[PDB]
Design a protein around this ligand. Sequence first.
Ligand SMILES: Nc1ncnc2c1ncn2[C@H]1C[C@H](O)[C@@H](COP(=O)(O)OP(=O)(O)OP(=O)(O)O)O1
Ligand SMILES: Nc1ncnc2c1ncn2[C@H]1C[C@H](O)[C@@H](COP(=O)(O)OP(=O)(O)OP(=O)(O)O)O1
Ligand SMILES: Nc1ncnc2c1ncn2[C@H]1C[C@H](O)[C@@H](COP(=O)(O)OP(=O)(O)OP(=O)(O)O)O1
Ligand SMILES: Nc1ncnc2c1ncn2[C@H]1C[C@H](O)[C@@H](COP(=O)(O)OP(=O)(O)OP(=O)(O)O)O1
Ligand SMILES: [Mg+2]
Ligand SMILES: [Mg+2]
Ligand SMILES: [Mg+2]
Ligand SMILES: [Mg+2]
Lengths: 481, 481, 481, 481
Amino acid sequence: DTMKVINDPIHGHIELHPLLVRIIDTPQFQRLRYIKQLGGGYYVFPGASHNRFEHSLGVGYLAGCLVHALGEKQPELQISERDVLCVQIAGLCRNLGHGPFSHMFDGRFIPLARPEVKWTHEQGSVMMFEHLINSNGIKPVMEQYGLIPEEDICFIKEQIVGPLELWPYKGRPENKSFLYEIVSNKRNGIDVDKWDYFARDCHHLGIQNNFDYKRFIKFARVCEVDNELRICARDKEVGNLYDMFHTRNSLHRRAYQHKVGNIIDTMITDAFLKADDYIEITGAGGKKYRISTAIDDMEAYTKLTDNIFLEILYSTDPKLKDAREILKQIEYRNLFKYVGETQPTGQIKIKREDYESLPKEVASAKPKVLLDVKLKAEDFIVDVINMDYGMQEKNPIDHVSFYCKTAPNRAIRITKNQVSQLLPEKFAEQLIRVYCKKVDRKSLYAARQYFVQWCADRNFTKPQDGDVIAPLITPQKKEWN
Amino acid sequence: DTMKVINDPIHGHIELHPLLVRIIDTPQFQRLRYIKQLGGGYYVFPGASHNRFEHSLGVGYLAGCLVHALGEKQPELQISERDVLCVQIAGLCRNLGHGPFSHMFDGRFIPLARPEVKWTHEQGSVMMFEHLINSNGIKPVMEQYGLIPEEDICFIKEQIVGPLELWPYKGRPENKSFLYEIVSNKRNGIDVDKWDYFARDCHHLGIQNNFDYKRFIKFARVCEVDNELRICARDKEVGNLYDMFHTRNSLHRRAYQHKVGNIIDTMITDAFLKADDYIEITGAGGKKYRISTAIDDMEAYTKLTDNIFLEILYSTDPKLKDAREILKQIEYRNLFKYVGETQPTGQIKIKREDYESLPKEVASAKPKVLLDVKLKAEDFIVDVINMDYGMQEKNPIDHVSFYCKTAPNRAIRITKNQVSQLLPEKFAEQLIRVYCKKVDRKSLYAARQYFVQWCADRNFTKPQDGDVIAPLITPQKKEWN
Amino acid sequence: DTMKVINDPIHGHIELHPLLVRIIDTPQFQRLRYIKQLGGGYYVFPGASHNRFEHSLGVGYLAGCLVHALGEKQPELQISERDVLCVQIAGLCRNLGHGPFSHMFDGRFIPLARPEVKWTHEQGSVMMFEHLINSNGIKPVMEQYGLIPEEDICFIKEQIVGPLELWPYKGRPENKSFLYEIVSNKRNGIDVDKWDYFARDCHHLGIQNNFDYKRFIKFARVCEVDNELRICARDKEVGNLYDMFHTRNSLHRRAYQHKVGNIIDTMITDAFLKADDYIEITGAGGKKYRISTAIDDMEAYTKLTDNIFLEILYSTDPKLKDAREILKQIEYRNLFKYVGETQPTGQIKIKREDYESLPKEVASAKPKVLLDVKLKAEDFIVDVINMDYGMQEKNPIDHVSFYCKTAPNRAIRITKNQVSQLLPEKFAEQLIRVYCKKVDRKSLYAARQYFVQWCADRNFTKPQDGDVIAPLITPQKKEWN
Amino acid sequence: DTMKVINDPIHGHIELHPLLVRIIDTPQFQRLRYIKQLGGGYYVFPGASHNRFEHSLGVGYLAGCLVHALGEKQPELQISERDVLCVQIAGLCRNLGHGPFSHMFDGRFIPLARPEVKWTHEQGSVMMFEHLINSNGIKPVMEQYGLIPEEDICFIKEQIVGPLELWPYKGRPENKSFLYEIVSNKRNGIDVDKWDYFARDCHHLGIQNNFDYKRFIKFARVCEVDNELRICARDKEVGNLYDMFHTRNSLHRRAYQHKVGNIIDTMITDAFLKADDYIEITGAGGKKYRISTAIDDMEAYTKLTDNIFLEILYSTDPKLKDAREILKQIEYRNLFKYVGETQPTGQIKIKREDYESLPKEVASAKPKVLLDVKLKAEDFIVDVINMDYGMQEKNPIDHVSFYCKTAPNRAIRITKNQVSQLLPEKFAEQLIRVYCKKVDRKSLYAARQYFVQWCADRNFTKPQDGDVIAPLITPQKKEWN
Ligand SMILES: Nc1ncnc2c1ncn2[C@H]1C[C@H](O)[C@@H](COP(=O)(O)OP(=O)(O)OP(=O)(O)O)O1
Ligand SMILES: Nc1ncnc2c1ncn2[C@H]1C[C@H](O)[C@@H](COP(=O)(O)OP(=O)(O)OP(=O)(O)O)O1
Ligand SMILES: Nc1ncnc2c1ncn2[C@H]1C[C@H](O)[C@@H](COP(=O)(O)OP(=O)(O)OP(=O)(O)O)O1
Ligand SMILES: Nc1ncnc2c1ncn2[C@H]1C[C@H](O)[C@@H](COP(=O)(O)OP(=O)(O)OP(=O)(O)O)O1
Ligand SMILES: [Mg+2]
Ligand SMILES: [Mg+2]
Ligand SMILES: [Mg+2]
Ligand SMILES: [Mg+2]
């Protein structure tokens, strides 16, 4: 009937139009209350107990903020209330597709359990959105508030995942192009989703966010770039933009890719793999689904949350023992041991199809050290992490358009060399982490010897503690000394 | 085994002694990750996703800080490393006894499901602590780090629950009396648990804390009080102490007793009550327990967490339908409708044995106004809330000892009239919230009529919106104008 | 001449219309950079380095926020861009009249240097506003942006000071009465000026503000209260409002009325008094003024800031010696010693005319103890402090209009007992601080004896440290023991 | 003479040993209350009202924190209470040398006024410190607390300015080498002074700090390196350390070197030059000094603060006409107009001896464009800014020693390529800002043509707005297209 205000620790009092309220008060949306934003990160950062629900509320709020700001500052854009509401709904709903422990599910679990499939949290979000609309009678409420369900549901979906397939969009015409740069910016990655998680994740982790989104919004404009309307930033702000991405990198280095967080996500993925044949999830029309197939039926996926973890933990079934055990070793803090980190040298790169051959390589290394144990390939875990500014090797700032103070409607480009000599020369790199499943003293020592020798063989960078953990090995490599 | 550092958003970097680490990494302790601090409050304040785990870490840390401060400022107290460790353990382990959704369980569920039982989260914390120790072989680790298990375990439990059985404590003699004022203050309720939940709940709820625990600790001393050594505060701080309780009251007014938060706790409690016969929880041996009898076997209670919500939510069994449905309504935001709040006048209390009878009274009122429907007692929920300063009718500051700059070893008392004329004249009051389970507009109108007629009948305070919700009744009461 | 944006630590990025900018970039306004918000409080709280300038920007910002909110919510109020700019301007300029060290000047120095006159900071702000406008050619700029300066300048001045003197305002008609409730609220004291200083002062003091003005703004409406259009709060906000004033009180108890801060403001006031004959302030036509007479000429007052403090401190003129030495003592932290605090009892009220006679009364005590040295009226400082909720003995909440969810246009009233029984009985009280200019040990012992006896004879409250600093005098009362 | 507690918004309740209080409560130290930390920054960031005084308290506090942490974790270092006091004093007093508006004085004014001398705020701090010591009789107090003034005064000065000229320090022997890395780190610039200004400047500016000093402290140790005990950081903190210097750089980009802030500092500097002949500051033996010579007499320097600005602004002296006017043009916000920024390309670098020639080069540029007027050399201001990681062209992390989990007492080194490929390739650069003193539109258009052309001739980087403010010049340069 009427609008609701919600108090958020990050954004303060957020105003929710009744349509948005109808959307969030559904099993499909409330589901996000039971999915950790950072998953295994909670087991390293105890403040990171926040869930995808609150983050979703924040994203919808900020999307509303940005579209409103653009509207008030440039009434010649013809932004309407329909537009604002659709942008807000896309903002609210672009996290609907995340599975248990967030990045754990689409990052590790699904690629292993369903490698024949190409699955993304985006597509999950489109499917869940469809299922929410259809299961909850949302369309007549949309029509009741001035929306046109065909066009606008199309628009929302396109905001979430991109062209559902010349102007490639059917949800909105060319003159409203800029609207697709708010929720998920596929042009340069600068969107309100990032802003919310910067602020929220920082608030919960105990790290401080250094990026000011309100300032960005206040300096944002729509300008014409190559016969298309885009969101441009003031020239002055280029530095801030670089810093924004630097911040993202920082957050990944400190929190999101923390080695123990990662190994915990790994162990949970392993347990889920071992439980997949024995856990059942009741989907549409009584049908039974498993963890790995819940994504085929949205009624089932609706009921796939962090809960499973606990179901495996509290299970009495013998067939779940293995699974139940791995989780139990997480509770006792008996985790796989971190052996080290290294990087490839030069423009050398490691391709994904080769990842699987890596633990065999490590165990196949021959350190000239006397060892009482010999470890095998399956005693090693090798996590390959690609760190980049969101556009592979590309500088995302090269894909931002700027406007100057004398001519607010004339878009310009700014090159890196126009800003600072202290900026990165590369915008992508790989980090290689090696762990050992054997956790006792001797096994760990051996694992370090194998690891450093393997780094030396592949001409990788010298591990930071190399001289300490493998003093009989590091002198061999002239390039290291 | 060496110490570990944990980054907490509230307290920053927290140092954990290896014995504490050993205690934390148990299923009995890690269980607290799956119990929300404010339970139903999360469904009103989406920032409040925090659990009992992180709060527990905070309490342990704060206990450590206070004891260390006391020790270093006053070396004559013979505070030992053993003492510091035991106080830290007490702080860490005093939330182990909480149930699903915390307050909902000891405050609402257990009293209704087992009226004869006398359950407290303190007792549960003691039992769960015993269970942790004996299940994880902590005793030898304790003696490895210099504790004597038989005395120090007693000390810890006494810190949590009070005297198990003229000096009543067996863990420490009178000259260490002050040590029992740190983790759970039975004398005046000024303890580190409060400080942690003020800061933490405020950080998560998005409402802000005005109390400064660090200042308090800075000015904390131990002084002789009536044969005992007791923690005393600098005189100047008296105003800050009253304010502390004020803050507590405030936090209860805005968040913990939010009418809607409370009604959701109520709906969940009702759902658990209707699910109690059908949810089985395996304990020691394989003996099955219920949600309501889990508190009799710690191996089962270890597995009793917020998960039971989702269990009930995800169930399919017809026997669970009623319990499932309720939860589902919560998801759809079909909550019982708030009719209004009122208070009794004079020295007139609603005893507790009188609670159940209240809904009958509301339905028995005669509002001489045409009604589309008649309402019965089962259509009403009457929630009676006791707001106080933690010592019933008493003023806890009267039970605080102070010291002065000129003679910092002399305990004194400070009265209310010595502080301010603007303090509360009373320290305990009752709030009466009335809800109607019937949600339609007719039923709700009627419910407002019954409610205001009821308030008039027993000379309760006029509902704030009385003249607007029931204009045909309020004029019958001349003291309401 | 475009909009400017200023980054504020409290409110983030504030937008400033070119008219506001033009007003701000004048010496009359920039003057505020050189006056401390809390004056001598900076000498107790090193974080309180903030000046009236930033506070002013904040007040203007918040005034804009509130008008914009009201207008966007209720378009039928006919709030014009003109109204918005005028409210903003009044927000910006209502601190123009503050003197050196703010409160020190109008509340201590001026009433002692010019006892004949009634000077307030409001009046100073209207005169300074007039001077700013007239000396900077603002009127045609006001006209350039659609203002009509006769009635609009009248309106701004009225917002600052009240009716210039049935509807007494000439700037805006009765139907816009609510506009007068934003910058300086004469009805209940709830205005945006308070909100800014709560947040700003807390930010700098190292104390946290627990009041949420954004929430209040979000719940504010305009309703008809006795043929008058007035700002009204949502009913359930009532608690927060009590808390608002509570916070004000605590802020005064913890910082603004800090005893050492007050004694430092007293010593500075004294030094200014001893320098008043010798300092020359140049005004219009080259006429010279003193510190106490600069208020008579806005050109001179424009150059009357905290600068004076240093001019005295750095001076070599022997005429200034006395003054100078006082300040030097402050630098050496040789302050008058704090003797103690006490309050009147029953229905006793310390009248202002009596304030002068109190040092004699104290010195005219007769304790009956050993005494080395006798003290005189000269040696004593008696500071009487009036602590209230902004309306003397009245409850400001009784002068707030509320509205209920069910009928947002229908304004109602709410009594204290409709809220809580833990709220204050009285809403005004007096505090009595005694200091001694003789700082040695024997003299201080003396002063303490004198003081306690004086509390006994005038039936005052026993000072908190009574039993320790004067154990030979406390048993003589009765109601103290 | 007891210990004091000060509430600081950044660090909370800081405690101060009475010797520290003795040093603090002097005109020499208290003088810092009247010198703004960021100077002209206040005129761009209104939150930046904070002074050198509170910063100094912060630095002393942090210095004590770090030396205490090291001592507590590593007893074998034999850190004495006396060491702690000396480090706290050095931390407290290392800002004594600062002049009016801080950086404005030592970075701009003195270089222009006194080109024949080499002045630094460090040298000034040592001088001011000696003056403080001698003027306030602190040597006997130092002795009262177990300090040995001959050794310890030298030690403190050495911490402030370096060796007063194998082991070149007289204050402490090699085995206390680490003690010189706390207050002013000449080895790599990682010190507690930076930490405090990071946190404090961020708190006041309204931009957020992402560096965690507490974390660094928790992970710091002392290890042997090249025959001396130095402060080593844990290996895994290397990223954080790089980020520390990024933060610093960022703070300079956004705030400290804000183009308007810098131009305001430049105008104030010019005013001071034009006022230097006429302002008198009386020092020792009533001897008068100029602003430019006050550094030659500590008694005079003690009275050289921000006050001078006001002294110039409030003057009536005809001789101070030209100075006063300039400051007045600051108040009316008639500042020099920012023409633009550029950088040198490649290895090319501008030596300071050439700075004065830069305005000439710009006016002597020949843009092939129509100019309505013609600008000369003195119509241009050219500001050259060196941005570095504090060690000119060197990577400071290459001068950081690290330690590993597995061998805490073994010091190691970590190279840039062992950390990341996304780090800076360069560690110093130059920014060149150009402003125009003539503010009219024609002059300014011309100034842009001149500036851009100058950039082209010098092979400088293209100004970010080049294609807009100078459409005719920019497409003539090949290196830009
Ligand atoms: N006193 C408070 N201070 C700050 N936040 C609050 C306070 N009370 C409630 N909140 C939060 C909780 C919610 O997230 C959000 C809105 O709740 P609330 O204002 O109480 O609406 P409501 O639905 O409970 O009442 P109603 O339906 O009668 O308007 O604000
Ligand atoms: N860069 C960071 N900044 C702030 N907090 C961090 C950072 N990295 C990790 N944390 C947090 C997460 C943990 O709660 C706590 C400890 O993490 P960490 O220092 O990495 O210990 P660790 O156990 O992973 O490594 P190790 O065993 O080698 O000491 O600090
Ligand atoms: N990177 C930044 N982050 C946060 N605040 C900033 C930043 N840069 C400047 N500010 C602040 C300082 C001012 O208070 C306010 C406006 O400064 P700024 O955006 O630089 O406008 P400006 O007047 O200096 O340039 P212009 O006239 O070209 O717009 O924002
Ligand atoms: N209630 C308060 N809350 C927070 N900070 C406070 C409060 N009162 C004072 N402060 C601050 C101001 C000072 O910087 C610091 C110390 O003040 P305070 O404790 O009152 O010492 P004091 O010197 O005035 O009294 P005393 O000498 O009797 O101990 O704490
Ligand atoms: Mg408690
Ligand atoms: Mg501007
Ligand atoms: Mg006021
Ligand atoms: Mg330095």
